[PDB]
RNA sequence: CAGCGAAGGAUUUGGUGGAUUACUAGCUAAUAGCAAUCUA
């Protein structure tokens, strides 16, 4: 029916689900607004997917993010990964694929840990 | 040949004086291609 | 003259974002207060060994800078400073506390001497990094040493270590917190005023290197 | 710069049709694929025609003026081509499957044999312009009952003698006013008559059956009409005749059989001259030069041909190719000779100046997967599914080392340290990278870390770190040497194929399975950028698949990429019919080539014809499998802008000819080729040189370069500015490799890299393809000339200074 | 005028013009010979493919054609051309200056008629040959006998008679004795059509008022009359499959099917052909066939089939209406704008003044089909605007193709006349695209372009703004605002780095993408009306209004060339795909070619109609021009691809003329020089013994040698010696007949001495010396210190000593090259 | 709910016709006859 997309995002044990759909521009983490996200010093670590590329790309979508597990910094990395690749997948499916790889170029030039988590560790020396 | 042609994805094609030996190695007009150790 | 119009409806989204944040979307500043550009490593020989060309928001990038050899000389200098600042037996792991206390530190660095505190801490590093030392060579097990020179990675690392442990030792049993103690240590190191712990230890080490040269 | 015309097709020296010499015994026309190759024998060269047919071609002929040829494929889509300009002239659709076409000795009428009808047409002209309908039909004759098999003329253009799978063989007069001169019909053979020939004077008519019979018709008496005078015979037992030709003036018959044998006779005496074989598969086509010195034999199934001089038994060229087994490619580090590794397990070695092989290596049992060169030109390694990575010296042209595993696992990719001290191979079923020392053949180690099969390997050409890529969606960087053995992983989105790292050894291009190609700087783990290469590769819908070409996902990815040699442009090829090339700074496609436009290959068309679909099953899955189109491995040449791609029809080789282009460089209103020629005739040589470089017209470069005299080549080679050195260095290379003024070229090179050696020294990667062509030129003509002139010097000195008389 | 670069080839995309066609049968086939202006065309009628064309044009326009079995009789200004398979087989010049009007063919007597009621009839020399070749006589109808002529034909079963149909009377002839036989009655109004009937000896003839008289010429009466209100009748026919059906065609675009057995209208057809282009010019039943071939003047040919009846019992009373069957058309007005679709030069696009868009195919001329104006529905809830009636689109001005993402999203863009937006299309599935790209500043669209990565579209409005769009969503990306009047040309690079804007103000703005700043501005001193970017070579050629073609390279922003020499507005350019030439056509009825290296004008064709648009093919073989008049599109073949052409500035050394350059033999005698040709001659000569030993299966020269010996120069000997085969060289040089004197050996060593004295072919002279040394150097070592051969070897080494500078040079160069490529 | 929006809008599906390869006319006993017939 309504155009939606669901993406994930994982730090150590925290897991973030992101439902991105066409909307009016509201970004919610467990119903809380995006501004009211603890521990208040990594609010910009949460902000940087919606801040690197400008809010005009967020004007037509609305995002709801569930988070489980992990501590504080793991939850904020999971949130920002889910937000980022949800925006990328929405632009891959429903709008400009040129805007998709523009966004992918921006996020990968900043840090690709905002798009792909670094899973397979450790090393037996 | 028959077992690995059916176990694959890409297609596999399959007295007088001489059979003329068209697939020859060693040829830049070479006669003593041996090493001096080998001599 | 000339214009470029990219946006055609202003930013009015349903979760109303703070205005300083949607002003920071035009250009990235550290902590939404300090622009990383017009900040230069005044010295040579530490340029491309103190990362300042890649701006960040907070000093908590979670990259991997210890698996290869020299790639800890590419994570930015502010969180290099805060990772050395977290190191003591009482307070390991607490890098969020470390981030917020260097936030208060470089904030009062700005409100005392206002150019920008990232420039203050960059030329503090360039002035504190020692340029020679010695090595305790054997020599028959005598009192024997020989002056050598210092590679710039060791210079930057030893400067950061000297600044952080000097702030800790000057804030051990005083009224001042580690925040303002690191602030005054960085200001004295930026002037090179021969007063702070790191510049004193640097000139001492170069003095004994010149003596035993 | 990026306008790669289709230059040559290496491999597959003949597949299907009829060989044909030119008028002058210089060029041999071979029906290679859907195209025609031309092998120039004396000027030891070759090319392939750029035009293509929609199926495999089946008839070649050019007129005796050597001006235009026609070529006819399996359904009669005849295509004629200006031979001296290599462009197409007109397409035509003869309505049924042709068998043989022949221009006249006059060359004004060509007749062909479509099915049972023969038809004479008159030719168009090279001099008269390109008309809409140029073919004017002379006549069409229908005297036969089954398909015509062969066709000949008289020595003049008056009678035409045809022969068929109908047991008879007949004759015809080309005008309507010589009907009494020849209208009869020669019955009498047991099987398919496929030879019918006039003698040198037109009175004897030799006819040749399929089962080895030769009749000699002659217009003699018991008015009197064409009595058979003799039934000579062949008596090859299970070898019925496959192909016949007959040189009239030297009176030479040449017959190839089913048994893979040929014999040539002196026919009017019927004396067997030569009887000998080329293999166990039939000689499909004989043809003979007009001067009778040379013959040409093509055998289709092994794909071989052979031009044989029968007076003095000296073989001019004997060659054999492959088909749809061209599994990998390499260049020699001087871009002069190519190595083709083929899936039946053999290592052909071609060269680019000619078109011929010079050495196979028939060693491996099962397939050869990948090859590459190492250690300063003359070692190349080959890696198989036998369980063998074996070395090859390319001077003694022999094996010298064979590394195996410990358990016979099939290998899939290999790399080798540029300092040729370690050789690394990766498999499908062991998850490891095997490292072997090469100076001692023992297994050095096996290093692990993946959990899927390693798809591709590489070594960095400068700092010797290794980059592997595997189906764990993972690329992994090993630093092996120097006391450490340090690994570093890098995740990627989908699983990986086709790693290829830059000649600086600073970054790595990987070709992931989702249709994307990423680039990773290897000093960091940081991705520089990636090209979405999916929506710009046309993947042909097959004959048997029940999905569209759009939703198909057989080949929507790449399987071999390679850099250019400045590190600026990735060429890429996959299991689809597109080979693309991109430029990595702007991250954009800049050209896409299609590799084949014939439906004989499977996956060419993305939109199949609807009329072939039936109530059940398409009309091409009804047998009376079809080979897919793939490009298995693609490489840029070291010493050209040219690049090669090993597809199912052999090596395609595309190239730049900067001759036909206007590709200037910051000119303005005053600078003009007339202005450079006046600047040369008023002799300001430096100004005329840069005034020609700005035009970038290579014939002005040729003219100014030759007209500069010797006594100031140091002066102009000093004063030439910095931004023209890549152009002048690569020009001197690619002109000097086939030029003649050797001392002039060497004076120019000595002047250039004496006056400006240091600038090259600090811009090595700017001139990497520039002064590799120069070194190819040095060590592959000039060092040889010096070798023979020193041999003459020493043999003179010995034959004078020593004595002896007994 | 005649040309020297481009030869004209064919006017494609053209079907009919309005001349009444003819039809012919062959066995059980049917071919339609239609006229297109000057040449004609032969379609078949089953699949309606093209089959033939005239191989060369006519002097005037064709006014009337007919067709017997194999032969086509064309008729223009004074002649009648008997043609076979589209090739002219016999002219027939008429014995007058009067222009021919109509003709008919029957039996032996051909019969043509001029425009003054004079009828030349011709006769076959042999009652067995194929066509009437010989003049028989000249009848002449006078104004007493009837009006001025309008048709003539021989209706059937008449012994060498004929029927001339005037404007007022019908009048027969006996063409053997040249006699009139039966003038008919008087007819009270002008008649304009007369076609015979398949029943015995009657002819149906229709007037300018809408009545059809059915004259019975044997009876001399009329049998019936079909009355029709105020219809200018144009073309009758009859249906001959048994069921009798008359079919009239009215020049108001009507086709009326009358039954005749019960005098009833079976079915009318309204607006089948367009009214204003002539209506139904010619419509006929194929005989023994229940189909209809109509042709209008509006460049359209149609087939209408009659279905079998649905009443299996009643049958002929219930007649199903005519279906529509195959048809071939072009657009009926001269084409405005012209593009080439693919790189293979297979499809091309036209958009015409009658507001239709076509995809012509210049490969096979039954593949040409109209693109369709059926809007994709708005899937967000909106309703389609415009009007309720589906009119065609407004007139197309500009358009742009990029076949890079073809069919995956929208492909081509267009730019319509004086409407505020610019809709887009698709070329793969051939219909109108989803979106309409809009200018957002009320200015009409004047320039459109798109990136060669197929994503970004580019609208350039009349108010100077350049809005860029994405073409897989239809949304806007950014709005470049620099100009202050109508932007006339947009382009972007191959690799999307820099883009170029081109206004009417004279400002040419060099912008770059990915950083939306500009980086260059140029001001030319004229208004600018066109820009063609050569995406390969980064030049782009601009029109001006002081008639210059200013070529600017986009990198260093220089004005790199300025082509002067036109007299009126330059309507079009195209780069040659190599980028060497600019072909430009202009309103002084000229089309010139500029060789932009030399800046010169190679040739100028004086074309009779002003060519509006000029386009080169992706590959350099076809030049398609479209003119002021003519419904077609004329494609031109450049002979420059098959032969090299000059470069010489015309107005109504040969190497730099023909752009080539041969290499001289040697620069001077001081320099070495290898042999011209293969560099494998050296290896084959040095190894041909082991070459043949591995390739084995398991005198004139001596005459010339003593000639050159006694003349004491061996240059003719060396010219003989160099250039023949290695086998013959070794077989000759192996036997040199030297037992006591060795004069032949001294002559040969002195010959090689004189050869490498010149410093030429010295690799060959070295290997000839080495061949002799391997051949019979044993006798030289044996009777060494023989005075003659020792003198020959002494001065041979004394000339050989000069060739040590070569190894000094190459062992310098190799060592220093290895040093600068490694260290 | 809204707006878009010229005497309707938006979908499902059959049949026919044109393409999906590069356009030299049909038949036969074929240097010609036929196309109304190859028969005497």
UniProtKB/Swiss-Prot annotation, chain A:
GO MF: RNA binding; structural constituent of ribosome
Alphabetical keyword list: Acetylation, Cytoplasm, Isopeptide bond, Phosphoprotein, Ribonucleoprotein, Ribosomal protein, Ubl conjugation
Modified residues (Phosphothreonine): 68
Phosphoserine PTM positions: 32, 59, 74
Crosslink position(s): Glycyl lysine isopeptide (Lys-Gly) (interchain with G-Cter in ubiquitin): 28, 45, 57
Protein task: Component of the ribosome, a large ribonucleoprotein complex responsible for the synthesis of proteins in the cell. The small ribosomal subunit (SSU) binds messenger RNAs (mRNAs) and translates the encoded message by selecting cognate aminoacyl-transfer RNA (tRNA) molecules. The large subunit (LSU) contains the ribosomal catalytic site termed the peptidyl transferase center (PTC), which catalyzes the formation of peptide bonds, thereby polymerizing the amino acids delivered by tRNAs into a polypeptide chain.
Record PANTHER family: RIBOSOMAL PROTEIN S16, RIBOSOMAL PROTEIN S9
GO cellular component, one term: 90S preribosome
Domain of life: Eukaryota
Compartments, as annotated in UniProt: Cytoplasm
Family assignment from sequence similarity: Belongs to the universal ribosomal protein uS9 family.
Alphabetical GO biological process terms: maturation of SSU-rRNA from tricistronic rRNA transcript (SSU-rRNA, 5.8S rRNA, LSU-rRNA); translational initiation
Main location class: cytoplasm
Annotated InterPro entries: Ribosomal_Su5_D2-typ_SF (IPR020568), Ribosomal_uS9 (IPR000754), Ribosomal_uS9_CS (IPR020574), Ribsml_uS5_D2-typ_fold_subgr (IPR014721)
Organism: Saccharomyces cerevisiae (strain ATCC 204508 / S288c)
Miscellaneous field: Present with 33800 molecules/cell in log phase SD medium. There are 2 genes for uS9 in yeast.
Curated annotation (Swiss-Prot), chain C:
Keywords: Acetylation, Cytoplasm, Isopeptide bond, Phosphoprotein, Ribonucleoprotein, Ribosomal protein, Ubl conjugation
Keyword Ubl conjugation: yes
Sites bearing Phosphothreonine, chain numbering: 15
Assembly information from the UniProt record: Component of the small ribosomal subunit (SSU). Mature yeast ribosomes consist of a small (40S) and a large (60S) subunit. The 40S small subunit contains 1 molecule of ribosomal RNA (18S rRNA) and 33 different proteins (encoded by 57 genes). The large 60S subunit contains 3 rRNA molecules (25S, 5.8S and 5S rRNA) and 46 different proteins (encoded by 81 genes).
Protein family according to the UniProt entry: Belongs to the universal ribosomal protein uS7 family.
A GO MF label: mRNA binding
UniProt cross-references to Gene3D superfamilies, sorted A to Z: Ribosomal protein S7 domain
Species annotation: Saccharomyces cerevisiae (strain ATCC 204508 / S288c) (Baker's yeast)
Glycyl lysine isopeptide (Lys-Gly) (interchain with G-Cter in ubiquitin) crosslink, residue number(s): 33, 191
Gene designation: RPS5
Single Gene Ontology BP annotation: ribosomal small subunit assembly
PTM comment: N-terminally acetylated by acetyltransferase NatA.
Name of the protein this chain belongs to: Small ribosomal subunit protein uS7
Presence of keyword Nucleotidyltransferase: no
Domain of life, source organism: Eukaryota
Cellular-component GO terms for this entry: 90S preribosome; cytoplasm; cytosol; cytosolic small ribosomal subunit; ribosome
Compartments (UniProt record): Cytoplasm
Swiss-Prot record, chain D:
Record-level GO BP terms: endonucleolytic cleavage in 5'-ETS of tricistronic rRNA transcript (SSU-rRNA, 5.8S rRNA, LSU-rRNA); endonucleolytic cleavage in ITS1 to separate SSU-rRNA from 5.8S rRNA and LSU-rRNA from tricistronic rRNA transcript (SSU-rRNA, 5.8S rRNA, LSU-rRNA); endonucleolytic cleavage to generate mature 5'-end of SSU-rRNA from (SSU-rRNA, 5.8S rRNA, LSU-rRNA); establishment of cell polarity; maturation of SSU-rRNA; maturation of SSU-rRNA from tricistronic rRNA transcript (SSU-rRNA, 5.8S rRNA, LSU-rRNA); ribosomal small subunit assembly; septum digestion after cytokinesis
Membrane-spanning parts: none
One GO location term (cellular component): small-subunit processome
PROSITE patterns: WD_REPEATS_1 (PS00678), WD_REPEATS_2 (PS50082), WD_REPEATS_REGION (PS50294)
Key words, A-Z: Nucleus, Phosphoprotein, Repeat, Ribonucleoprotein, Ribosome biogenesis, rRNA processing, WD repeat
WD repeat residues: 11-51, 52-92, 93-131, 143-182, 188-222, 236-275, 278-318, 321-360, 363-402, 406-448, 449-488, 491-530, 553-592, 626-664
Subcellular location: Nucleus, Nucleolus
Family membership noted in the UniProt record: Belongs to the WD repeat PWP2 family.
Name of the protein described by the UniProt record: Periodic tryptophan protein 2
Organism, as annotated: Saccharomyces cerevisiae (strain ATCC 204508 / S288c)
Gene label: PWP2
UniProtKB/Swiss-Prot annotation, chain E:
InterPro entries in the cross-refs: Quinoprotein_ADH-like_sf, SSU_processome_Utp21, WD40/YVTN_repeat-like_dom_sf, WD40_repeat_CS, WD40_repeat_dom_sf, WD40_rpt
Main location: nucleus
BP term (GO), one: rRNA processing
Cellular compartment(s): Nucleus, Nucleolus
Cellular component terms per the entry's GO annotation: 90S preribosome; nucleolus; nucleoplasm; nucleus; Pwp2p-containing subcomplex of 90S preribosome; small-subunit processome
SUPFAM superfamilies xref list: Quinoprotein alcohol dehydrogenase-like, WD40 repeat-like
Keyword vocabulary terms for this entry: Acetylation, Nucleus, Phosphoprotein, Repeat, Ribonucleoprotein, Ribosome biogenesis, rRNA processing, WD repeat
WD repeat ranges per the UniProt record: 22-53, 63-93, 101-140, 150-183, 190-227, 234-269, 277-329, 336-370, 397-436, 445-479, 487-523, 528-563, 565-606, 608-646
Keyword Ribonucleoprotein: yes
PROSITE patterns the record matches: WD_REPEATS_1 (PS00678), WD_REPEATS_2 (PS50082), WD_REPEATS_REGION (PS50294)
Keyword Phosphoprotein applies: yes
Pfam families: Beta-prop_WDR36-Utp21_1st, Beta-prop_WDR36-Utp21_2nd, Utp21
Stated role: Involved in nucleolar processing of pre-18S ribosomal RNA and ribosome assembly.
Note: Present with 2020 molecules/cell in log phase SD medium.
PANTHER family: WD REPEAT-CONTAINING PROTEIN 36 (PTHR22840:SF12)
Domain notes: The WD repeats are grouped into two tandem seven-bladed beta-propeller regions.
Quaternary context: Interacts with snoRNA U3. Interacts with MPP10. Interacts (via WD repeats) with UTP18. Component of the ribosomal small subunit (SSU) processome composed of at least 40 protein subunits and snoRNA U3.
Protein name per its UniProtKB record: U3 small nucleolar RNA-associated protein 21
